[PDB]
Amino acid sequence: ADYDLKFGMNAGTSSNEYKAAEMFAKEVKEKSQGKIEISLYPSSQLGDDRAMLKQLKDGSLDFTFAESARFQLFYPEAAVFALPYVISNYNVAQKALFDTEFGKDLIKKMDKDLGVTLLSQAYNGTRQTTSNRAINSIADMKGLKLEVPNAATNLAYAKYVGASPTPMAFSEVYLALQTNAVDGQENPLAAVQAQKFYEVQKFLAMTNHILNDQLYLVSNETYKELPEDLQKVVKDAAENAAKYHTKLFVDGEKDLVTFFEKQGVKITHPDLVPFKESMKPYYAEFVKQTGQKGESALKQIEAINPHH
Numbered sequence: 001a002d003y004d005l006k007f008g009m010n011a012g013t014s015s016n017e018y019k020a021a022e023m024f025a026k027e028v029k030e031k032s033q034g035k036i037e038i039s040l041y042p043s044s045q046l047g048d049d050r051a052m053l054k055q056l057k058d059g060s061l062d063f064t065f066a067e068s069a070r071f072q073l074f075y076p077e078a079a080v081f082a083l084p085y086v087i088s089n090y091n092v093a094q095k096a097l098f099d100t101e102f103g104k105d106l107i108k109k110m111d112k113d114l115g116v117t118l119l120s121q122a123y124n125g126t127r128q129t130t131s132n133r134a135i136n137s138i139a140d141m142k143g144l145k146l147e148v149p150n151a152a153t154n155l156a157y158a159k160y161v162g163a164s165p166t167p168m169a170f171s172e173v174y175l176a177l178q179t180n181a182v183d184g185q186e187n188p189l190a191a192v193q194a195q196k197f198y199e200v201q202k203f204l205a206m207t208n209h210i211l212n213d214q215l216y217l218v219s220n221e222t223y224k225e226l227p228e229d230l231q232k233v234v235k236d237a238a239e240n241a242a243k244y245h246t247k248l249f250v251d252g253e254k255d256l257v258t259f260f261e262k263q264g265v266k267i268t269h270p271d272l273v274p275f276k277e278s279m280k281p282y283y284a285e286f287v288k289q290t291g292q293k294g295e296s297a298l299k300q301i302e303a304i305n306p307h308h
């Protein structure tokens, strides 16, 4: 095609993310009259999200996904998006990104410093905790070898509840669980399904600890070369796909607990008050490290009412 473009992702071919990316690719090919074709590169084929963000910056990859929280790699105060229990729900995540001074500045910096244009934001689920033994209370987390992505906020979740975090690549997790080299992991339910972690985890605990969004991102080096009518095709398609993406996740969260029960998984509902209490020293440490920019971002987010 005139524009043979590439969209990389860590999620696999059975995931919501892949499904929504297929919708995006289809719409762009149709509405561009075949001028643009977008090929998908799932399962970390091109590296992980940190690696794919570098590739968008350089111009060697055209599209990828990232959470708003992942920009904590560059701007420490952006960890606010994944401090456990701080962001209440997706309504708050949307307003945090688009309707605060903090979020609006972050979007501008992504463009200026990191070479990426934010096309749209979707919901990517709320993280829960699976394990090879029951989590009936925070006490059960003690010494649990909890696999997490290599991201400071997930490492801190594990640390502050008393678990022993082991950071790993997403592709390696299934085998780590199966072999009991680790005792659990902490993705949203849709990823537990997509990765078939339920085949290798007898327990699921509703820890509700981190709220994931998902940003549809384009390399500035690619976006700048598209005539404005094709830029509009891509932007409109990204917005349409994001609504569909969010819907997949919202619908799954209704149904997936019952799906896992029928696969033989036991579900627990530990008291979250001690989980939330355990994070108070982490928020303090966040404010100590990130200074006034962090305190301000927290304030702006804590002001957002979570009811639509």
Ligand SMILES: CC(=O)N[C@H]1[C@H]([C@H](O)[C@H](O)CO)O[C@](O)(C(N)=O)C[C@@H]1O
Pocket: 009, 010, 011, 048, 049, 065, 066, 067, 069, 070, 148, 149, 150, 151, 169, 170, 187
């Ligand atoms: C956009 C993306 O790649 N998301 C991935 C996510 C993020 O890397 C971390 O939450 C850090 O932001 O990590 C996973 O949940 C994980 N490795 O278990 C897999 C997700 O597909």
